[PDB]
């Protein structure tokens, strides 16, 4: 079949499956090929999820409690993965900026206060502020 081939190849080239899960999907395809569109679907669902587990797992600016709270939330509901990941990254930046703007060596306290205030006012420029801070810290380096 032509659906069989596209599903076979797609399942074969999903990056975030272990070997056993991939081989199980594929063996289910061999068993009843008429279930291709189902098998592929959940396989993609299983990929999109596990990828997520990795990314939040490797968000350096969150502690274990926050990370595995996001992981558990991802398990209790897989379908909102796209949301749970996004909001997690937005936390990461937010908590990173705060820390870096505090623990960064070469800023004077006027700049530091200004950054902490602009950060408390609007965290949506967290990534910007942090960036703007790092550059500043490097431009004023010894």
Author numbering: 36 to 177
Could you pull the original sentences from the published paper?
Here, we propose a method for generating proteins and protein complexes with complicated shapes using fusions of alpha helices. To design amino acid sequences that can stabilize the alpha helical structure of the fusion sites, we superimposed one or two turns of terminal alpha helices of connecting proteins using a molecular graphics program. Then, the amino acid residues important for forming a fused helical structure were chosen from the two natural sequences in the superimposed region. Our method does not require complicated computer calculations for the design process and can be used for the assembly of artificial protein complexes with predictable and rigid structures.
We thought that proteins with alpha helices at both their N- and C-termini might be fused to generate artificial repeat proteins by connecting the C-terminal helix of the repeating unit to the N-terminal helix of the next repeating unit. To test this design strategy, we used a protein A domain as the repeating module and generated 3-, 4- and 5-module repeat proteins. All these repeat proteins were successfully produced in E. coli and could be crystallized. In the crystal structures, all the repeating units were connected as designed. The twist and bending angles of the fused helices were very similar to those of the ideal helix. Interestingly, the protein A modules in the crystal structures, especially the last ones, exhibited significant structural variation, and close structural analysis demonstrated that this structural diversity was due not to the helix fusion but to the intrinsic flexibility of the protein A module.
